[PDB]
Design a protein around this ligand. Structure first.
Ligand SMILES: *[C@@H]1O[C@H](CO)[C@@H](O[C@@H]2O[C@H](CO)[C@@H](O[C@@H]3O[C@H](CO)[C@@H](O)[C@H](O[C@H]4O[C@H](CO)[C@@H](O)[C@H](O)[C@@H]4O)[C@@H]3O)[C@H](O)[C@H]2NC(C)=O)[C@H](O)[C@H]1NC(C)=O
Ligand SMILES: *[C@@H]1O[C@H](CO)[C@@H](O[C@@H]2O[C@H](CO)[C@@H](O[C@@H]3O[C@H](CO)[C@@H](O)[C@H](O[C@H]4O[C@H](CO)[C@@H](O)[C@H](O)[C@@H]4O)[C@@H]3O)[C@H](O)[C@H]2NC(C)=O)[C@H](O)[C@H]1NC(C)=O
Ligand SMILES: *[C@@H]1O[C@H](CO)[C@@H](O[C@@H]2O[C@H](CO)[C@@H](O[C@@H]3O[C@H](CO[C@H]4O[C@H](CO)[C@@H](O)[C@H](O)[C@@H]4O)[C@@H](O)[C@H](O)[C@@H]3O)[C@H](O)[C@H]2NC(C)=O)[C@H](O)[C@H]1NC(C)=O
Ligand SMILES: *[C@@H]1O[C@H](CO)[C@@H](O[C@@H]2O[C@H](CO)[C@@H](O[C@@H]3O[C@H](CO[C@H]4O[C@H](CO)[C@@H](O)[C@H](O)[C@@H]4O)[C@@H](O)[C@H](O)[C@@H]3O)[C@H](O)[C@H]2NC(C)=O)[C@H](O)[C@H]1NC(C)=O
Ligand SMILES: *[C@@H]1O[C@H](CO)[C@@H](O[C@@H]2O[C@H](CO)[C@@H](O[C@@H]3O[C@H](CO)[C@@H](O)[C@H](O)[C@@H]3O)[C@H](O)[C@H]2NC(C)=O)[C@H](O)[C@H]1NC(C)=O
Ligand SMILES: *[C@@H]1O[C@H](CO)[C@@H](O[C@@H]2O[C@H](CO)[C@@H](O[C@@H]3O[C@H](CO)[C@@H](O)[C@H](O)[C@@H]3O)[C@H](O)[C@H]2NC(C)=O)[C@H](O)[C@H]1NC(C)=O
Ligand SMILES: *[C@@H]1O[C@H](CO)[C@@H](O[C@@H]2O[C@H](CO)[C@@H](O[C@@H]3O[C@H](CO)[C@@H](O)[C@H](O)[C@@H]3O)[C@H](O)[C@H]2NC(C)=O)[C@H](O)[C@H]1NC(C)=O
Ligand SMILES: *[C@@H]1O[C@H](CO)[C@@H](O[C@@H]2O[C@H](CO)[C@@H](O[C@@H]3O[C@H](CO)[C@@H](O)[C@H](O)[C@@H]3O)[C@H](O)[C@H]2NC(C)=O)[C@H](O)[C@H]1NC(C)=O
Ligand SMILES: *[C@@H]1O[C@H](CO)[C@@H](O[C@@H]2O[C@H](CO)[C@@H](O[C@@H]3O[C@H](CO)[C@@H](O)[C@H](O)[C@@H]3O)[C@H](O)[C@H]2NC(C)=O)[C@H](O)[C@H]1NC(C)=O
Ligand SMILES: *[C@@H]1O[C@H](CO)[C@@H](O[C@@H]2O[C@H](CO[C@@H]3O[C@H](CO)[C@@H](O)[C@H](O)[C@@H]3O)[C@@H](O)[C@H](O)[C@H]2NC(C)=O)[C@H](O)[C@H]1NC(C)=O
Lengths: 235, 276
C-alpha cells in the first residue's frame, strides 16, 4: 500500500472488498464459492446486523461499478474465531458467508489454503495489496496497489518490538530500513506468497505499531494453524 | 496563573467497578447504577460460579446501551483460555447465552462519553440447559437433536429433519498423503471398498468429485490387501452411482486413487504483453 505500485486488472482476482454504510472499512479474500476470510479485529461489535454489510467482487476502481465485472453480494452469517480476547491481539480470524454462490470466471479466483507440514523460511519475498492510505493522513480513491516485503523471524520481531506478546501465532514482515508498510487503512488484506506457479495464503493483515518507521515489522495472523477450523465448515 | 478554571475534572483512573464473584443465592444485579447511568472508562468483571458438571444460563431483563463503541463480552474460561461465546451491543432485546462449563465471565467495556441506563442480568443454573433432549429408540443423533431411526447415513435423499446431512461416507484408509489413499464406502455401518474390477475413468472422476478434489489422475490397483465386506460399484445411466452389496466374494482388488488438486488461484487472466 504505502510506497507500492499500482496494479492492473486481473492481477489479483482473489482480493475482494467489503463495504459498511457506503464506506470502505475492511478487506477480505475469496476462499470458496460462498465463503470469505477477513481479520476479526475490524469486524467486531457489528456482528448483530449482517444485512448492513455489502460484498464487492472484482473491485478494481472506485470511480463507478456499473461495468459488467462487479457483482454485489450480501453477508448472511458472520463467524468469529472463539480464540480471541482483544487484549493480546492474538488469533483474530473471521469468516463470512455469502447469500448466493458466484460463478468462477477470469476475474474471480479463490485462494489456496496452505497444507500441513509446510515451512516458509524467513527472507522469502511475498506480495501484499490493499486500498489503504499512502500519505498516512488521507484516503485512497484509486486502483488497487501492490508491494513486496521480506519475511522476518519471531525472535527478530520480538527484539525489534519488545512491547507486545508476539508468541508463536503471529507472522512479522517488513524491510529493516522501512519505506513500505501496508498496515494502515486496509486491515483485511491478505498476505500472499507463491510456490511453483500457485499463490497460497500466508497471513491476514493485523495491527501494527506505525507504518514506515524503521525496525517496525508488521503483524500477520498465522494460517497454517487454522486450516482445519476453516475446512470444518468450508463445505 | 492557574489556566484551569476551578471545576472538577473527570479524573477517573483505573476502572472502579463492583462485585467480582457471586453464587446461586443472588441472581439479579446491575453494573453500577441501573436507573440513571454508568461511569465512563470503566472495566468491571463479574465471575459466575456454579457446581461442577452444571451449565449456566444467562438472561437480560433490560438492555439499552449506546451504538457500537461499547460492547459486552461473555466468556466461559478466564483460567487458561476462553472463547468469545456471544457478544451483544446496541439497543434492543438480546437472546439468552448458554455455557458448556461451570464458570462464566462477564465483561463490560465503555468509552468516555455517551452514558446510558445499563443492564440487569438473570442468573439461572441447571443440568444440560443448552443441550436438547437425547434421542431415544436408538435413533440417529443429529446436530439439531432430531431423532430418526434410519433416514440418513448417506441415503439417496434428504429425509432427515435437519436437511443438512451433507456428509459423505468416503474416506482414505491408511494412504500416503491427503490426496492418496484407499477408497472405502460405508453403505449402512461398515466401511468397505467398491470393487474396482470394472473401474473406469468416469467412476474415478465421480469419486474425486465426492471428495472435493479434481479429476481422475491415477487408478492403478495393486492387490486386495484388506479382506473387508467388498461391495460392487458400477456406472449408471443417470448422474448417480449405484453401489451393489456383493459381500463374501473372492478374486477382488482394492482401489488406489490419487485425485489431482482442484483448480485454484493461478493468474489465468489474459494480461497484455508490454513491448519493452
Ligand atoms: C452461473 O452458472 C449457471 C450455470 O453454469 C447459470 O445457470 C444458467 O441460467 C440460465 C438463466 O438464463 C439458464 O438458461 C435458461 O435455461 C432454462 C432451462 O429451462 C430455459 O428455459 C431458458 O430459456 C430457454 O427456454 C425458453 C422457453 O421459451 C426459450 O424461449 C429460450 O430461448 C431458451 O431456449 C434459459 O435458456 C441456464 O440453463 C443455466 N445453466 C444451466 C447449466 O442450466 C447461472 O445463470 C450463472 N449465473 C449465476 C448468477 O448463477
Ligand atoms: C492399513 O495399515 C495397517 C498397518 O499398516 C494394516 O494392518 C496390517 O495388516 C497386516 C495384514 O494385512 C498385518 O500383518 C500381519 O500381522 C500379524 C499380526 O500383527 C502378524 O503376525 C503377521 O505376521 C505373519 O508372518 C510372521 C512371519 O512369518 C509370522 O510369524 C506370523 O505368525 C504371521 O503369520 C503379519 O505381519 C499387520 O500386522 C497389520 N498392522 C497392524 C499395525 O495391525 C491394515 O490392513 C491396512 N488397511 C488397509 C485397508 O489397507
Ligand atoms: C466507469 O469506469 C470505466 C473504467 O473502468 C469506464 O469504462 C470506459 O470509460 C471510457 C471513458 O473514456 C470509455 O471510452 C469511451 O467510450 C466511448 C464509447 O461509448 C459511447 O459510444 C458512443 C460514441 O461513439 C455513444 O453514443 C454511446 O452512448 C457511448 O456513450 C467512445 O466513443 C469514446 O471515444 C471513449 O473511447 C470506454 O468505452 C469505457 N469502457 C467500458 C467497457 O465501459 C466507464 O465508462 C465508467 N462509467 C461511467 C458511467 O462513467
Ligand atoms: C450475595 O449472597 C451472599 C451469600 O451467598 C452474601 O454473602 C453473605 O451476606 C451476609 C449478609 O450480611 C453475611 O452475613 C454477615 O456475616 C458477618 C460475618 O462475616 C464477617 O466476618 C468475616 C470473617 O470471619 C468477614 O470476612 C466478613 O466480611 C464479615 O466481616 C456477620 O458479622 C454479620 O452480622 C452478617 O451476619 C455473610 O457473611 C456473607 N457471606 C460471606 C461468605 O461473607 C452477599 O451479601 C450477597 N450479596 C449482597 C450484595 O447482599
Ligand atoms: C526480494 O526483493 C528484494 C527487493 O527489495 C530484492 O532485492 C534486490 O536484489 C537485487 C539483487 O542483488 C538488487 O540488484 C542490485 O542492482 C544493483 C544496480 O546497480 C547492482 O549493482 C547490484 O549488484 C544488485 O544486482 C536490487 O537492488 C534489490 N532491490 C530491489 C530490486 O528493490 C531481492 O533480491 C529479492 N529476493 C530475495 C531477498 O531473496
Ligand atoms: C509473552 O507471553 C509469555 C507467556 O504468557 C510470557 O512468559 C511468561 O513471563 C512471566 C514473567 O512475567 C514468567 O513468570 C516467571 O516464571 C519464572 C519461571 O521460573 C519464575 O521464576 C518467575 O518468578 C515468574 O513467575 C512466565 O513463566 C512466562 N511463561 C508463561 C507461560 O507464563 C512473556 O513474558 C510474554 N512477553 C514476552 C515479551 O515474551
Ligand atoms: C513449476 O516450475 C517449473 C519450472 O521448471 C514450471 O515448468 C515450466 O512450465 C512452463 C509452462 O507453465 C513451460 O513453458 C512452456 O515451455 C514449452 C517448452 O517446454 C513451450 O513450448 C511453451 O510455449 C511454454 O513456454 C516451461 O518450459 C517449464 N519449464 C521447464 C524447465 O520445463 C512449471 O510449470 C511450474 N509449475 C508446476 C510444475 O505446477
Ligand atoms: C428472569 O427472572 C424472572 C424473575 O422471577 C423469572 O421469572 C419467572 O419465570 C418463571 C418461568 O417462566 C415463571 O414460572 C412460570 O409462571 C407461569 C405463569 O406466568 C406458569 O404458567 C409456569 O408454569 C411457570 O410456573 C415465574 O412465574 C416467573 N416469576 C414471576 C415472579 O412471575 C424468569 O424465569 C427469569 N428468566 C430466566 C431466563 O431465567
Ligand atoms: C497427476 O498429477 C501430477 C501432479 O504432480 C501430474 O504431474 C505433472 O505432469 C505434467 C505432465 O506430464 C508435467 O508437465 C511436464 O511437462 C514437460 C514438458 O516437456 C515434460 O518434459 C515433463 O516431463 C512433464 O511432463 C508436470 O511437471 C508434472 N508435475 C510435477 C509436479 O511433476 C500428472 O501429470 C498427473 N497425471 C495425469 C495423468 O495428468
Ligand atoms: C464388468 O465387465 C465385464 C467384462 O466385460 C462384464 O462381463 C461381460 O458380460 C457380458 C454379458 O453377457 C450377456 O450375454 C447375453 C446373451 O447371453 C447378451 O444378450 C448380452 O448382451 C450380454 O452380452 C458377457 O457377454 C461377457 O462375456 C462378459 N465379459 C467377461 C470378461 O466375462 C460385466 O457385465 C461387467 N459388469 C458390470 C458392467 O456391472
Amino acid at each position: 500500500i504505502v510506497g507500492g505500485s499500482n496494479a492492473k486488472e486481473g492481477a489479483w482476482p482473489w482480493v475482494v472488498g467489503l463495504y459498511y454504510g457506503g464506506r470502505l472499512l475492511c478487506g477480505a479474500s475469496l476462499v470458496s464459492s460462498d465463503w470469505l476470510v477477513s481479520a476479526a479485529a475490524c469486524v467486531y461489535g457489528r456482528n448483530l446486523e449482517p444485512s448492513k454489510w455489502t460484498a464487492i467482487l472484482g473491485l478494481h476502481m472506485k470511480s463507478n461499478l456499473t461495468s459488467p465485472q462487479t457483482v454485489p453480494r450480501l453477508i448472511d452469517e458472520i463467524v468469529i474465531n472463539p480464540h480471541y480476547n482483544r487484549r493480546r491481539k492474538d488469533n483474530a480470524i473471521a469468516m463470512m458467508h455469502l447469500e448466493f454462490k458466484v460463478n468462477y470466471t477470469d476475474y474471480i479466483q479463490p485462494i489456496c489454503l496452505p497444507e500441513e507440514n509446510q515451512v516458509f523460511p524467513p527472507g522469502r519475498n511475498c506480495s501484499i495489496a490493499g486500498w489503504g492510505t499512502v500519505v498516512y493522513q488521507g484516503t485512497t480513491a484509486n486502483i488497487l496497489q501492490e508491494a513486496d516485503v521480506p519475511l522476518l523471524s519471531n525472535e527478530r520481531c520480538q527484539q525489534q518490538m519488545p512491547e507486545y506478546n508476539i508468541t508463536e501465532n503471529m507472522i512479522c514482515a517488513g524491510y529493516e530500513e522501512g519505506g513500505i508498510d501496508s498496515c494502515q487503512g486496509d486491515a483485511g488484506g491478505p498476505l500472499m506468497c507463491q510456490e511453483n506457479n500457485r499463490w497460497f495464503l500466508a497471513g491476514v493483515t493485523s495491527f501494527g505499531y506505525k507504518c514506515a518507521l524503521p525496525n517496525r515489522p508488521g503483524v500477520y495472523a498465522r494460517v497454517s494453524r487454522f486450516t482445519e477450523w476453516i475446512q470444518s465448515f468450508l463445505h | 496563573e492557574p489556566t484551569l478554571v476551578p471545576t472538577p475534572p473527570p479524573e477517573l483512573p483505573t476502572d472502579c467497578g463492583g462485585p467480582f464473584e457471586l453464587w446461586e443465592p443472588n441472581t439479579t444485579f446491575s453494573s453500577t447504577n441501573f436507573p440513571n447511568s454508568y461511569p465512563n472508562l470503566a472495566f468491571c468483571v463479574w465471575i459466575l460460579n456454579a457446581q461442577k458438571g452444571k451449565n449456566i444460563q444467562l438472561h437480560f431483563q433490560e438492555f439499552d446501551l449506546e451504538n457500537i463503541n461499547d460492547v459486552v463480552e461473555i466468556r466461559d474460561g478466564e483460567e487458561a483460555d476462553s472463547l468469545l461465546l456471544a457478544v451483544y451491543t446496541g439497543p434492543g432485546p438480546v437472546k439468552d447465552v448458554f455455557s458448556t462449563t461451570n464458570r462464566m465471565t462477564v465483561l463490560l467495556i465503555t468509552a468516555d462519553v455517551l452514558a446510558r441506563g445499563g443492564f440487569k442480568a438473570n442468573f439461572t443454573t441447571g443440568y444440560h440447559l443448552g443441550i436438547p433432549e437425547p434421542c431415544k429408540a436408538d435413533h440417529f443423533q443429529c446436530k439439531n437433536g432430531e431423532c430418526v431411526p434410519l433416514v440418513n447415513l448417506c441415503d439417496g435423499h434428504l429425509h432427515c429433519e435437519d436437511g443438512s446431512d451433507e456428509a459423505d461416507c468416503v474416506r482414505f484408509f491408511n494412504g500416503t498423503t491427503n490426496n492418496n489413499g484407499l477408497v472405502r464406502f460405508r453403505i449402512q455401518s461398515i466401511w468397505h471398498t467398491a470393487c474396482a474390477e470394472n473401474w473406469t475413468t468416469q467412476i474415478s472422476n465421480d469419486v474425486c468429485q465426492l471428495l472435493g478434489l479434481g479429476s481422475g489422475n491415477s487408478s492403478k490397483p495393486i492387490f486386495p490387501t484388506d479382506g473387508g465386506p467388498f461391495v460392487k460399484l458400477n456406472t449408471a445411466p443417470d448422474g448417480h452411482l449405484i453401489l451393489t452389496p456383493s459381500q463374501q466374494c473372492l478374486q477382488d482388488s482394492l482401489i488406489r486413487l490419487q485425485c489431482n488438486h482442484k483448480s485454484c488461484g493461478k493468474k489465468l487472466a489474459a494480461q497484455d504483453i508490454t513491448p519493452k
